[PDB]
Write an enzyme that holds these catalytic residues in place. Structure first.
Site, PDB file in Angstrom:
ATOM      1  N   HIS C 206      -3.313  40.519   4.311  1.00 38.48           N
ATOM      2  CA  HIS C 206      -2.860  41.195   5.544  1.00 38.48           C
ATOM      3  C   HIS C 206      -3.247  42.782   5.103  1.00 38.48           C
ATOM      4  O   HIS C 206      -3.279  43.503   6.041  1.00 38.48           O
ATOM      5  CB  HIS C 206      -1.442  41.525   5.651  1.00 38.48           C
ATOM      6  N   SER C 210      -7.306  38.602   8.615  1.00 38.87           N
ATOM      7  CA  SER C 210      -7.936  37.271   8.350  1.00 38.87           C
ATOM      8  C   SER C 210      -9.182  37.065   8.893  1.00 38.87           C
ATOM      9  O   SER C 210      -9.640  37.828   9.918  1.00 38.87           O
ATOM     10  CB  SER C 210      -7.211  36.236   9.344  1.00 38.87           C
ATOM     11  N   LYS C 232       0.404  27.893  18.204  1.00 42.24           N
ATOM     12  CA  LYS C 232      -0.722  27.068  17.655  1.00 42.24           C
ATOM     13  C   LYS C 232      -0.321  26.580  16.172  1.00 42.24           C
ATOM     14  O   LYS C 232      -0.352  25.336  15.889  1.00 42.24           O
ATOM     15  CB  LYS C 232      -2.128  27.980  17.396  1.00 42.24           C
ATOM     16  N   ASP C 233       0.368  27.367  15.297  1.00 46.93           N
ATOM     17  CA  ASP C 233       0.858  26.965  14.255  1.00 46.93           C
ATOM     18  C   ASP C 233       1.972  25.847  14.386  1.00 46.93           C
ATOM     19  O   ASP C 233       2.192  24.912  13.558  1.00 46.93           O
ATOM     20  CB  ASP C 233       1.449  28.064  13.362  1.00 46.93           C
ATOM     21  N   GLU C 276      -2.132  11.713 -10.965  1.00 42.07           N
ATOM     22  CA  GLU C 276      -1.907  11.616  -9.816  1.00 42.07           C
ATOM     23  C   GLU C 276      -3.162  11.829  -8.813  1.00 42.07           C
ATOM     24  O   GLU C 276      -4.331  12.315  -9.408  1.00 42.07           O
ATOM     25  CB  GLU C 276      -0.713  12.532  -9.206  1.00 42.07           C
TER      26      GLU C 276
HETATM   27  C1  HEM Z   1       0.541  27.771  -2.090  1.00 39.56           C
HETATM   28  C2  HEM Z   1      -0.331  27.574  -1.220  1.00 39.56           C
HETATM   29  C3  HEM Z   1      -0.863  28.578  -0.361  1.00 39.56           C
HETATM   30  C4  HEM Z   1      -0.175  29.222   0.709  1.00 39.56           C
HETATM   31  C5  HEM Z   1       1.283  29.035   1.115  1.00 39.56           C
HETATM   32  C6  HEM Z   1      -1.506  29.848   1.266  1.00 39.56           C
HETATM   33  C7  HEM Z   1      -0.925  30.765   2.290  1.00 39.56           C
HETATM   34  C8  HEM Z   1      -1.830  31.401   3.039  1.00 39.56           C
HETATM   35  C9  HEM Z   1      -1.626  31.963   4.262  1.00 39.56           C
HETATM   36  C10 HEM Z   1      -0.155  32.235   5.049  1.00 39.56           C
HETATM   37  C11 HEM Z   1      -2.667  32.476   4.826  1.00 39.56           C
HETATM   38  C12 HEM Z   1      -2.935  33.700   5.770  1.00 39.56           C
HETATM   39  C13 HEM Z   1      -3.200  32.424   7.118  1.00 39.56           C
HETATM   40  C14 HEM Z   1      -4.465  32.021   6.896  1.00 39.56           C
HETATM   41  O1  HEM Z   1      -5.518  32.704   7.151  1.00 39.56           O
HETATM   42  O2  HEM Z   1      -4.564  30.560   6.962  1.00 39.56           O
HETATM   43  C15 HEM Z   1      -3.765  32.334   3.869  1.00 39.56           C
HETATM   44  C16 HEM Z   1      -4.949  32.703   3.940  1.00 39.56           C
HETATM   45  C17 HEM Z   1      -5.987  32.566   2.698  1.00 39.56           C
HETATM   46  N1  HEM Z   1      -5.995  31.835   1.690  1.00 39.56           N
HETATM   47 FE1  HEM Z   1      -4.259  30.896   1.188  1.00 39.56          FE
HETATM   48  N2  HEM Z   1      -2.451  29.752   0.579  1.00 39.56           N
HETATM   49  C18 HEM Z   1      -2.473  29.038  -0.473  1.00 39.56           C
HETATM   50  C19 HEM Z   1      -3.317  28.546  -1.168  1.00 39.56           C
HETATM   51  C20 HEM Z   1      -4.686  29.252  -1.344  1.00 39.56           C
HETATM   52  C21 HEM Z   1      -5.558  28.818  -2.227  1.00 39.56           C
HETATM   53  C22 HEM Z   1      -5.482  27.799  -3.271  1.00 39.56           C
HETATM   54  C23 HEM Z   1      -6.800  29.496  -1.894  1.00 39.56           C
HETATM   55  C24 HEM Z   1      -7.815  29.434  -2.801  1.00 39.56           C
HETATM   56  C25 HEM Z   1      -8.456  30.457  -3.395  1.00 39.56           C
HETATM   57  C26 HEM Z   1      -6.309  30.285  -0.961  1.00 39.56           C
HETATM   58  C27 HEM Z   1      -7.223  31.246  -0.103  1.00 39.56           C
HETATM   59  C28 HEM Z   1      -6.969  31.643   0.913  1.00 39.56           C
HETATM   60  C29 HEM Z   1      -8.002  32.617   1.825  1.00 39.56           C
HETATM   61  C30 HEM Z   1      -9.355  32.704   1.405  1.00 39.56           C
HETATM   62  C31 HEM Z   1      -7.337  33.094   2.785  1.00 39.56           C
HETATM   63  C32 HEM Z   1      -8.137  34.006   3.797  1.00 39.56           C
HETATM   64  C33 HEM Z   1      -8.198  33.093   5.279  1.00 39.56           C
HETATM   65  C34 HEM Z   1      -9.230  33.902   5.994  1.00 39.56           C
HETATM   66  O3  HEM Z   1      -9.335  35.053   6.223  1.00 39.56           O
HETATM   67  O4  HEM Z   1     -10.137  32.960   6.606  1.00 39.56           O
HETATM   68  N3  HEM Z   1      -5.068  30.111  -0.297  1.00 39.56           N
HETATM   69  N4  HEM Z   1      -3.165  31.597   2.668  1.00 39.56           N
HETATM   70  C1  HEM Z   2      12.537  24.279  -8.010  1.00 38.91           C
HETATM   71  C2  HEM Z   2      12.129  23.265  -7.117  1.00 38.91           C
HETATM   72  C3  HEM Z   2      11.872  21.901  -7.475  1.00 38.91           C
HETATM   73  C4  HEM Z   2      12.780  21.089  -8.186  1.00 38.91           C
HETATM   74  C5  HEM Z   2      14.344  21.446  -8.710  1.00 38.91           C
HETATM   75  C6  HEM Z   2      12.291  20.016  -8.633  1.00 38.91           C
HETATM   76  C7  HEM Z   2      12.850  18.664  -9.158  1.00 38.91           C
HETATM   77  C8  HEM Z   2      12.150  17.429  -9.322  1.00 38.91           C
HETATM   78  C9  HEM Z   2      12.817  16.413  -9.805  1.00 38.91           C
HETATM   79  C10 HEM Z   2      14.291  16.239 -10.375  1.00 38.91           C
HETATM   80  C11 HEM Z   2      11.803  15.308  -9.605  1.00 38.91           C
HETATM   81  C12 HEM Z   2      12.063  13.809 -10.109  1.00 38.91           C
HETATM   82  C13 HEM Z   2      13.067  13.171  -8.868  1.00 38.91           C
HETATM   83  C14 HEM Z   2      12.021  12.390  -8.263  1.00 38.91           C
HETATM   84  O1  HEM Z   2      10.946  12.578  -8.172  1.00 38.91           O
HETATM   85  O2  HEM Z   2      12.809  11.312  -7.394  1.00 38.91           O
HETATM   86  C15 HEM Z   2      10.853  15.800  -9.255  1.00 38.91           C
HETATM   87  C16 HEM Z   2       9.541  15.195  -8.948  1.00 38.91           C
HETATM   88  C17 HEM Z   2       8.570  15.820  -8.512  1.00 38.91           C
HETATM   89  N1  HEM Z   2       8.019  17.076  -8.185  1.00 38.91           N
HETATM   90 FE1  HEM Z   2       9.308  18.356  -8.120  1.00 38.91          FE
HETATM   91  N2  HEM Z   2      10.918  19.864  -7.988  1.00 38.91           N
HETATM   92  C18 HEM Z   2      10.467  21.055  -7.588  1.00 38.91           C
HETATM   93  C19 HEM Z   2       9.654  21.838  -7.013  1.00 38.91           C
HETATM   94  C20 HEM Z   2       8.380  20.885  -6.940  1.00 38.91           C
HETATM   95  C21 HEM Z   2       7.328  21.474  -6.467  1.00 38.91           C
HETATM   96  C22 HEM Z   2       7.055  22.614  -5.634  1.00 38.91           C
HETATM   97  C23 HEM Z   2       6.095  20.459  -6.447  1.00 38.91           C
HETATM   98  C24 HEM Z   2       4.926  20.702  -6.182  1.00 38.91           C
HETATM   99  C25 HEM Z   2       3.994  21.208  -6.856  1.00 38.91           C
HETATM  100  C26 HEM Z   2       6.803  19.505  -6.995  1.00 38.91           C
HETATM  101  C27 HEM Z   2       6.142  18.189  -7.422  1.00 38.91           C
HETATM  102  C28 HEM Z   2       6.850  17.279  -7.814  1.00 38.91           C
HETATM  103  C29 HEM Z   2       6.152  15.829  -8.149  1.00 38.91           C
HETATM  104  C30 HEM Z   2       4.856  15.390  -7.857  1.00 38.91           C
HETATM  105  C31 HEM Z   2       7.139  14.957  -8.614  1.00 38.91           C
HETATM  106  C32 HEM Z   2       7.029  13.585  -8.874  1.00 38.91           C
HETATM  107  C33 HEM Z   2       7.783  12.529  -7.679  1.00 38.91           C
HETATM  108  C34 HEM Z   2       7.755  11.061  -8.181  1.00 38.91           C
HETATM  109  O3  HEM Z   2       6.780  10.476  -7.909  1.00 38.91           O
HETATM  110  O4  HEM Z   2       8.596  10.580  -8.630  1.00 38.91           O
HETATM  111  N3  HEM Z   2       8.271  19.618  -7.406  1.00 38.91           N
HETATM  112  N4  HEM Z   2      11.000  17.321  -8.822  1.00 38.91           N
END
Ligand code: HEM
Ligand code: HEM
Ligand SMILES: CCCCCCCCCCCCCCCCCC(=O)OC[C@H](COP(=O)([O-])OCC(O)COP(=O)([O-])OC[C@@H](COC(=O)CCCCCCCCCCCCCCCCC)OC(=O)CCCCCCCCCCCCCCCCC)OC(=O)CCCCCCCCCCCCCCCCC
Ligand SMILES: CCCCCCCCCCCCCCCCCC(=O)OC[C@H](COP(=O)([O-])OCC(O)COP(=O)([O-])OC[C@@H](COC(=O)CCCCCCCCCCCCCCCCC)OC(=O)CCCCCCCCCCCCCCCCC)OC(=O)CCCCCCCCCCCCCCCCC
Ligand SMILES: CCCCCCCCCCCCCCCCCC(=O)OC[C@H](COP(=O)([O-])OCC(O)COP(=O)([O-])OC[C@@H](COC(=O)CCCCCCCCCCCCCCCCC)OC(=O)CCCCCCCCCCCCCCCCC)OC(=O)CCCCCCCCCCCCCCCCC
Ligand SMILES: CCCCCCCCCCCCCCCCCC(=O)OC[C@H](COP(=O)(O)OCCN)OC(=O)CCCCCCCCCCCCCCCCC
Ligand SMILES: CCCCCCCCCCCCCCCCCC(=O)OC[C@H](COP(=O)(O)OCCN)OC(=O)CCCCCCCCCCCCCCCCC
Ligand SMILES: CCCCCCCCCCCCCCCCCC(=O)OC[C@H](COP(=O)(O)OCCN)OC(=O)CCCCCCCCCCCCCCCCC
Lengths: 483, 445, 386, 117, 70
Positions: C206, C210, C232-233, C276
């Site tokens: 921001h 964008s 759109k979102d 995974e």
């Molecule tokens: C937790 C995961 C992520 C979230 C929630 C997230 C969220 C956002 C949001 C809300 C925007 C603004 C809306 C948009 O332009 O699409 C954005 C833009 C962008 N994000 Fe992410 N993002 C994530 C992961 C990433 C990753 C891994 C990259 C890679 C470096 C990335 C690169 C960008 C770029 C380059 C933009 C600019 C879009 C443009 O101007 O065309 N984001 N992201």
């Molecule tokens: C603070 C918030 C979160 C808590 C407390 C949490 C807790 C847990 C727990 C207790 C499990 C095992 C239970 C189950 O899988 O049935 C689990 C599994 C998993 N979580 Fe989270 N989690 C959180 C956020 C996330 C986020 C943000 C991701 C992604 C990046 C994630 C990825 C996973 C994955 C891939 C598994 C394996 C699921 C499976 O195949 O059993 N978790 N989480």
């Protein structure tokens, strides 16, 4: 259809015209670039720096007479330089020097007051005077044949000057009416840097002390501070040294004779720099003006030339300056590019035992913080990272400025008198150039480490300065933590 | 570990001193066949000043430009065809020199100051900048904005405003064009206009390259391969100006100024000297030697209080003259100040009102002022350039001194009578609702 | 204007929210590929909420982790829905992040102004990788335990402190209860760090604005974000919800590994230890060049290349729509990434290892060919000028 | 350059044809793709460019963005009248780059720096 | 970040004075033809290495399997 021709639309025509202008600008001309070079380099001026011999003679009474004879010139400048000023006088007599400067041309035993002015005007020359914190000057510019008359007038006003109560009252009224934002900033900076020191007090002095002076303090000050060893008769232009010496011996005979001297006075009451800051916030003035200063170097200090080169590197920039953004000095470049300051200037001042080196700036209240940051950043780069190219450019600029400031018989006489009063000798141009050339990046770094690196500052600000950074900010920015 | 400045520094290769009486050099002038006048003289000081002067200005300006001279003065030593503005300023600062540009109604010049060593650099830079400048649109716009700011804060100096008003009101023609561009003309000024003005006006016969401390051989050797290849455009006829008089009245104390016209300017050399001596005799004011015992100071300034400023001014152009008195008083007593100025002007016209001692003092003051003014390298180079531009050669100073000697009471009274006979020009600025009418003031002469 | 109150959005209580979510100007020509950032934010919020509600029935103990997971599945009302949502939404979160990254790669949404945005995105990618790894270790299945063992054994690659680092991370001499508790605490902690990083990501974007599919300077034709890009979102969110329900209610365990339903047996080992599906490209990059320190160096080089992608110069033409060669290179890169991910789920036999070696080389050839192409095409206007 | 000239290289000719076809669909010149926020040398060049040229570039950019939003291209007649690669920014960009290069070579300071994001 | 001004005249119609979803399934053959023709190279480049590599892997595995059949 077909695309429009490049001479059909307004934007296409404008683009073609500007492209043609750029194409005609692209090609340079070697004949117009063969000699010039934008990268400064040291040069030898030994052949160029040829000047008439300055003859200096010491009379048995201690008087010094120095002459720069040039019989080709049709004019001449004859003056008396006295090692006296606001510093060498006590608190109870603070405006005495300025009051005596005003009264020196107002009446005497034979030339009167109006008769003296009539004689001066009929002679055609100009008789001027000025008193600094450490030097006093009474000099007359006259034609070649009027040098004896000017010398006689100077001797008469110096020795046989008699003051009347009515004239003293009139001059007191004039002084009160007279009592320059840059000047008041410099006065405040001097006061806040040399508090409890004779250099701190202003030349004008308090109004009550000015009014309490009548016909006795002036005579006492003359008898104390106008002794023969402290006066130099400087003559420049169409003057013969033997004639000048003979006339001085004939005329200057009733001079005061006291054992006191400037060195003894300085030893009795020295000058101490006290880091401090004064802010006069008004907000009714459109521009804010502030000066920051450091310890500085004295006249007889080998680092005085280094300080001159240092302030040359810091530079000076003005809104009307031709260079603008494109300039040698980094501080001036930054200021001109960012339009933060109305006018910036590095100033270096030298005294008997101390000095003042710093930056005085005028700027809008909005850009004060950025301007202060730029000033401090450049002043600390001045110790941490110095470029040989910048050092050479500053040395060339300093040489050019010192030589172009000569430009006439009266400044020649002024230079002779000031250099005598400061050093005991007149530094030749070749020796001065050698001293300047001896300064390099290592010397600049050493001198800046001596004078700026983690040292207390004296700040004097006036105007809309609510955005100006404070003393702790300035003191911390005086050094860098990255190195 | 260098010695203290009191002690001499070790071993130096310092040169032998010059003799006490160095032979004063005579000016040397060479005419490049396209018509370009290169002049030089030798000076003992290590500093050399080189100027380059042209007959351009407001008189040669056209109604299309109306401010071209001022903008050229501002657009001086900017980016050229060969080098950019950054290179220009870096080359200036490398040798430590100072640049300057002066724009006047009749002639304008570009001056450069540095040591005698860098003569080729000075000549090259000056010739390049004058000959082929690239009037870039962005630089022109920046200068235009700066001039806008200057005009917006121009009231701080009312003397220049009054002089401009007098020149605009008392003249109708070439000399009536203002030196400061107005709003509309500034807006319509631009890079192509400046380039056309330079191309049509910066013709070879109208350049004088003067040097103050440069040997003639070196200057010629450096400047010949830079100015020989220049079109030999014949000099255009001198623009004509006719004097009509008038009144300028602007509301913004009050500052009034009267003026007249002496026929003949610098070409009438004796009358120009008489006008300068008369101006010195008038003097004015607002230590000793600054015209403290002039007629205006003795009879108007100190005698009559509440007068903030009262002085005399003059301006001499080729075959044209102007002389007058500038006053600045409280608005309550403006008409009496105007009447007093008229009475002083009439009194000078009447014979026998100027003391022989007063005129001798005026002659001495004029001689001393000229002698002390030509003691500077910059003034010497400027004098060379202006003299060659006006008379085609640098007249010796002995001629001017002898003219000042030859002026007398009869001549000064005759010149004052000629001044009075010309139509009166008036310019008043400030609280101008109480000043007398132009017809009433003109009836006094 | 400030004399008396106006629309409550402009008030200081909602001023920042208004400026950053309602009145924020965005290009009017943004495609449906720009909703993936908001969709990834929604996926992250879903993961946080679902995990918070799962941690109320999960015990991080080696003797109770699997039993607690099964208790969530069976005894807890809706617990099967909770865990299926959590796992499959981690999968969809990685899916939408991959789409986000590849759309940015296509449209060069990183080049000059959004270098900090791209760097923050890379940091977010690292955080997601670590969080997903620990969360997959959490259930304490056979595959989870052995994948944790192997991936932590990669840490024994630094020549000096590798053994000390891996022993300290393990909490002991092997993956045991201490590792499970450590990973549970880290897996709870990181998603909030992920939220902070996402907020910094959004703020950094921001700062400038964008990018658009054209890649051109888009400030003359811009519209307010709320009335036009919230709908759109919303369309994107509903389509993602349909996809998410499809993958939860009908194919829950398809993306998962069957071996994770076997209680962790340290004595035995599964025939094929595979992470995974969304770690497969990184695993294949690891196993391409035959080494351990070499593989860790290759992973570090991959992340360094991703970080250094925005800092290349002379990329004056931004969008790939006006770059045929770069579009072909990007499509080859996407095919290479898909092939690498497929290879990562295969043994170390001869054709698989050869293809993995080739695929990584193509992956880095993308990161070299892009600067080469930019430098070559910097002089396009002078050559095709007409 | 040899291989970049469409006359001497067939691959360069096909690339130029494809680029012309792509640019003419949205009706914007190649120099319109240059971003003022990208280099800030483009920003300085556009600042030095005439107001008519800058306004025309902005109008073309707005038209292209509107067409992209509408998921449509220029009609056939306007596509035929489209003249991409008629440069207006390359010369001033080169001049700005040359000025920056000489400023960097002769010490100096940058006239403008990209703010840290 | 500041909005640049462009001299233009914009005519817009109310959302309720015109059809909404009718323009979606209109000119579908032309839209599909543009999608196919403008992106066939991209589709070939995306699905080229994938299909060829899959075929090569299948052939290699089949060859090895029959080679080790004893
Ligand atoms: C937790 C995961 C992520 C979230 C929630 C997230 C969220 C956002 C949001 C809300 C925007 C603004 C809306 C948009 O332009 O699409 C954005 C833009 C962008 N994000 Fe992410 N993002 C994530 C992961 C990433 C990753 C891994 C990259 C890679 C470096 C990335 C690169 C960008 C770029 C380059 C933009 C600019 C879009 C443009 O101007 O065309 N984001 N992201
Ligand atoms: C603070 C918030 C979160 C808590 C407390 C949490 C807790 C847990 C727990 C207790 C499990 C095992 C239970 C189950 O899988 O049935 C689990 C599994 C998993 N979580 Fe989270 N989690 C959180 C956020 C996330 C986020 C943000 C991701 C992604 C990046 C994630 C990825 C996973 C994955 C891939 C598994 C394996 C699921 C499976 O195949 O059993 N978790 N989480
Ligand atoms: C933090 C953000 C700023 C980071 C520093 C940025 C910087 O340039 O700083 C120097 C910069 C100098 O001022 P300047 O105006 O830029 O002037 C430049 C100087 O002329 C010249 O500046 P300089 O050359 O002196 O400074 C260069 C600076 C540049 O620093 C770096 O390059 C650091 C690089 C990373 C190092 C990592 C290790 O490097 C250093 O100072 C050397 C640091 C060496 C040690 C590094 C740390 C070692 C840890 C073990 O700013 C400061 O010094 C100000 C620092 C302000 C800190 C405020 C802390 C507030 C804490 C509040 C706590 C309570 C809050 C409420 C709690 C409850 C809430 C509910
Ligand atoms: C033989 C050669 C055959 C070549 C066929 C090429 C073709 O059909 O390309 C279609 C299409 C390209 O057509 P285009 O209109 O020239 O380009 C799209 C515009 O740039 C931008 O146009 P757009 O943004 O208006 O539409 C692009 C597409 C964008 O669709 C997506 O973003 C969904 C992607 C799902 C995978 O949107 C739709 O299809 C409309 C419905 C979107 C509903 C919202 C979906 C949000 C995500 C839901 C969860 C997905 C998991 O291909 C793609 O968009 C990429 C497909 C996947 C590649 C990996
Ligand atoms: C009281 C304040 C009223 C006010 O001024 O509101 C401002 C404003 C009202 O504006 P207005 O102009 O006064 O009213 C007319 C507008 O057109 C606003 O009216 P409208 O006709 O646009 O209302 C539409 C609204 C109607 O919503 C409702 O009626 C719900 C209550 O639709 C939504 O809230 C969208 C729901 C999207 C659901 C996406 C689900 C994704 C998958 C989740 C997992 C699925 C697993 C199976 O309200 C909004 O703009 C509504 C924004 C809603 C955003 C919802 C985002 C949900 C994300 C959830 C993620 C985490 C899920 C965890 C599980
Ligand atoms: C229970 C909580 C659960 C978690 C909630 C979300 C946590 C988010 C954490 C990060 C929040 C950072 C601050 C966000 C709000 C902000 O930045 O407000 C700034 C604003 C400053 O005042 P203002 O004069 O309006 O300045 C902006 C216009 N110049 O501030 C204001 O005007 C006051 C804002 C008050 C809070 C509004 C919501
Ligand atoms: C799990 C991992 C999933 C990774 C998915 C990566 C998706 C990357 C998307 C990048 C953006 C994109 O594909 O845009 C559509 C692209 C170009 O279309 P565009 O230039 O916007 O428009 C042409 C003129 N209207 O055009 C195309 O994509 C057309 C070719 C599609 C081939 C599909 C097979
Ligand atoms: C029984 C169905 C009756 C449908 C009656 C209306 C049919 C119709 O005209 O549909 C067209 C409409 C799009 O309308 P438009 O294209 O703008 O105009 C064409 C007409 N001149 O097409 C549409 O509106 C279709 C898209 C919107 C459908 C919304 C359905 C919502 C159902 C909610 C059920 C909730 C249950 C819990």
């Amino acid at each position: 259809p077909a695309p429009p021709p490049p001479t059909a639309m307004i934007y296409d025509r404008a683009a073609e015209a500007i492209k043609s202008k750029l194409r005609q600008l692209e090609n340079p001309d070697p004949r117009f670039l063969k000699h010039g070079n934008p990268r400064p380099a040291l040069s030898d001026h030994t052949r160029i720096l040829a000047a008439p011999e300055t003859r200096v003679t010491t009379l048995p009474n201690g008087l010094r007479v120095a002459t720069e004879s040039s019989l080709a010139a049709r004019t001449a400048t004859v003056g008396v330089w006295i090692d006296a000023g606001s510093r060498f006088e006590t608190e109870e007599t603070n405006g005495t020097a300025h009051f005596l400067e005003h009264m020196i041309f107002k009446g005497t035993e034979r030339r009167n007051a109006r008769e003296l002015e009539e004689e001066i005007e009929n002679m055609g020359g100009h008789l001027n005077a000025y008193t600094s914190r450490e030097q006093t000057t009474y000099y007359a510019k006259v034609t070649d044949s009027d040098v004896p008359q000017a010398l006689d007038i100077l001797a008469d006003i110096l020795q046989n000057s008699r003051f009347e109560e009515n004239r003293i009252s009139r001059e007191r009224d004039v002084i009160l009416r007279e009592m320059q934002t840059e000047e008041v900033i410099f006065d405040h900076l001097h006061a806040t840097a040399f508090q409890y020191t004779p250099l701190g007090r202003t030349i004008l002095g308090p109004a009550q002390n000015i009014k309490t002076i009548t016909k006795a303090h002036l005579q006492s000050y003359i008898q104390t501070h106008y002794t023969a060893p402290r006066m130099v008769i400087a003559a420049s232009g169409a003057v013969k040294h033997e004639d000048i010496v003979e006339q001085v011996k004939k005329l200057f005979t009733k001079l005061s004779t006291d054992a006191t001297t400037t060195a003894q006075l300085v030893a009795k009451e020295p000058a101490i720099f006290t880091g401090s800051e004064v802010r006069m916030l008004d907000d009714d003035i459109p521009l804010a003006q502030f000066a920051v200063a450091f310890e500085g170097a004295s006249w007889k200090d080998p680092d005085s030339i280094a300080l001159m080169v240092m302030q040359a590197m810091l530079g000076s920039w003005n809104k009307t300056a031709g260079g603008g953004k494109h300039m040698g000095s980094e501080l001036a470049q930054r200021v001109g590019i960012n339009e933060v300051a109305e006018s910036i200037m590095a100033f270096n001042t030298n005294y008997k035992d101390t000095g003042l080196f710093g930056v005085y700036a005028v700027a809008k209240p909005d850009c004060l913080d950025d301007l202060s940051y730029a000033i401090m950043q450049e002043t600390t780069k001045l110790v941490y990272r110095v470029s040989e190219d910048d050092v050479t450019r500053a040395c060339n600029q300093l040489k050019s400025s010192l030589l172009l400031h000569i430009d006439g018989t009266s400044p020649v006489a002024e230079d002779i008198g000031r250099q005598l009063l400061t050093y005991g000798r007149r530094i030749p141009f070749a020796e001065l150039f050698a001293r300047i050339d001896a300064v390099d990046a290592s010397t600049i770094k050493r001198v800046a480490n001596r004078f700026i690196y983690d040292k207390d500052v004296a700040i004097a600000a006036m105007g809309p300065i609510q955005r100006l950074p404070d003393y702790n900010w300035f003191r911390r920015r005086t050094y860098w933590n990255r190195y | 570990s260098l010695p203290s400045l009191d002690i001499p520094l070790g071993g130096v290769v310092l040169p032998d001193p010059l003799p006490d009486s160095v032979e004063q050099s005579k000016t040397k002038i060479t005419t490049l066949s396209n018509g370009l006048k290169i002049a030089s003289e030798t000076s003992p000081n290590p500093a050399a000043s080189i100027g380059l002067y042209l007959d351009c200005g407001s008189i040669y300006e056209t109604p299309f430009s109306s401010g071209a001279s001022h903008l050229l003065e501002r657009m001086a030593f900017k980016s050229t065809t060969n080098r950019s503005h950054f290179r220009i300023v870096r080359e200036v600062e490398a040798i430590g020199g100072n640049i300057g540009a002066s724009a006047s109604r009749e002639q304008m010049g570009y001056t450069f100051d540095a040591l005698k060593t860098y003569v080729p650099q000075m000549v090259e830079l000056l010739v390049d900048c004058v000959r082929n400048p690239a009037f870039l649109d962005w630089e022109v716009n920046e200068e235009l904005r700066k001039v806008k700011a200057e005009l917006g804060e121009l009231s701080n100096n009312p003397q220049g405003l009054l002089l401009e008003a007098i020149h605009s009101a008392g003249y109708s023609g070439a000399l009536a064009y203002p030196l400061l561009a107005p709003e509309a003309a500034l807006n319509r000024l631009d890079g192509p206009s400046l380039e056309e003005f330079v191309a049509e006006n910066y013709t070879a016969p109208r350049m004088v390259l003067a040097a103050a401390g440069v040997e003639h051989e070196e200057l010629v050797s450096i400047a010949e391969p830079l100015l020989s290849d220049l079109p030999n455009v014949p000099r255009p006829d001198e623009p004509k100006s006719v004097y009509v008089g008038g009144d300028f009245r602007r509301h913004g104390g009050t500052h009034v100024a009267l003026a007249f016209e002496v026929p003949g300017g610098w070409h009438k050399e004796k009358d120009a000297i008489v006008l300068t001596v008369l101006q010195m005799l008038m003097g004015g004011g607002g230590g000793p030697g600054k015209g403290m015992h002039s007629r205006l100071y003795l009879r108007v300034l100190n005698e009559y209080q509440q007068i903030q400023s009262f002085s005399a001014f003059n301006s001499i152009f080729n075959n044209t003259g102007l002389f007058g008195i500038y006053a600045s008083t409280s608005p309550d007593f403006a008409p009496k100040a105007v009447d007093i100025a008229a009475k002083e002007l009439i009194a000078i016209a009447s014979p026998g009102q100027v003391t022989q001692v007063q005129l001798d003092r005026a002659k001495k003051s004029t001689k001393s002022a000229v002698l002390m003014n030509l003691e500077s390298r910059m003034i010497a180079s400027e004098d060379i350039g202006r003299q060659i531009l006006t008379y085609g050669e640098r007249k010796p100073l002995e001629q001017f001194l002898k003219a000042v000697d030859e002026i007398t009471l009869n001549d000064i009274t005759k010149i004052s009578q000629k001044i009075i006979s010309s139509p009166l020009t008036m310019a008043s600025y400030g609280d101008v609702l109480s000043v007398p009418s132009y017809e009433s003031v003109n009836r006094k002469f | 204007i400030r004399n008396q109150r106006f629309s409550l959005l402009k008030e200081p209580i909602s001023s920042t929210l208004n400026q950053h979510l309602i009145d924020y100007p965005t290009p009017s020509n943004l495609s449906y590929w720009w909703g993936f950032g908001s969709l990834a934010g929604i996926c992250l919020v879903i993961q946080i909420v679902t995990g918070v509600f799962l941690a109320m029935h999960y015990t991080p103990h080696v003797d109770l982790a699997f039993n607690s997971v099964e208790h969530v599945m069976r005894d807890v009302e809706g617990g099967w829905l909770l865990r299926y949502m959590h796992a499959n939404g981690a999968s969809m979160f990685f899916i939408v992040v991959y789409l986000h990254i590849f759309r940015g790669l296509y449209y060069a949404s990183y080049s000059s102004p959004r270098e900090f945005v791209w760097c923050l995105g890379v940091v977010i990618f690292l955080l997601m990788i670590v969080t997903a790894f620990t969360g997959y270790v959490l259930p304490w299945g056979q595959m989870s335990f052995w994948g944790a063992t192997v991936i932590t054994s990669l840490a024994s690659a630094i020549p000096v402190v590798g053994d000390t680092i891996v022993t300290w991370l393990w909490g002991g001499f092997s993956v045991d209860n201490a590792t499970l508790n450590r990973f549970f605490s880290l897996h709870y902690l990181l998603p909030f760090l992920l939220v902070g990083a996402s907020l910094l990501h959004l703020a950094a974007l921001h700062q400038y604005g964008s990018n658009n599919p054209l890649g051109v300077h888009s400030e003359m034709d811009q519209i307010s974000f709320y009335p036009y890009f919230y709908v759109k979102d919303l369309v994107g969110w509903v389509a993602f919800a349909i996809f998410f329900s499809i993958w939860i209610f009908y194919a829950p365990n398809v993306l998962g590994h069957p071996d994770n339903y076997i209680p962790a047996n340290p004595m035995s080992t599964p025939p094929h230890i595979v992470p995974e599906w969304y770690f497969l490209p990184i695993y294949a990059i690891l196993r391409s060049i035959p080494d351990k320190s070499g593989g860790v160096a290759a992973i570090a080089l991959v992340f360094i290349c991703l970080l250094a992608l925005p800092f290349f110069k002379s990329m004056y033409v931004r969008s790939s729509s006006f770059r045929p060669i770069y579009q072909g290179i990007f499509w080859l890169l996407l095919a290479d990434c898909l092939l690498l991910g497929w290879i990562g789920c295969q043994p170390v036999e001869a054709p698989f290892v050869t293809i993995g070696q080739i695929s990584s080389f193509v992956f880095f050839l993308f990161f070299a060919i892009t600067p080469i192409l930019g430098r070559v095409g910097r002089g396009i206007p002078n050559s095709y000028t007409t | 350059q040899s291989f970049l000239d469409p006359k001497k290289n067939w691959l360069a000719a096909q690339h130029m044809k494809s680029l012309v076809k792509r640019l003419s669909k949205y009706g914007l010149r190649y120099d319109d793709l240059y971003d003022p926020y990208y280099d800030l040398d483009v920003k300085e060049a556009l600042n030095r460019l005439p107001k008519e040229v800058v306004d025309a570039r902005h109008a073309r950019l707005k038209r292209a963005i509107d067409l992209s939003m509408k998921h449509e291209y220029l009609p056939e007649d306007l596509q035929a009248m489209q003249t991409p690669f008629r440069g207006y920014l390359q010369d001033m960009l080169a001049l700005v780059k040359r000025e920056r290069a000489e400023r960097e070579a002769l010490g100096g300071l940058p006239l403008y720096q990209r703010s840290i994001p | 970040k500041q909005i640049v001004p462009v001299k233009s005249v914009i005519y817009a119609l109310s959302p309720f004075q015109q059809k909404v979803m009718t323009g979606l399934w209109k000119d579908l053959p032309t839209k599909i033809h543009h999608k196919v023709s403008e992106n066939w190279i991209s589709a070939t480049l995306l699905l080229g290495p994938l299909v060829g590599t899959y075929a090569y892997v299948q052939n290699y595995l089949e060859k090895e399997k029959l080679h080790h059949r004893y």
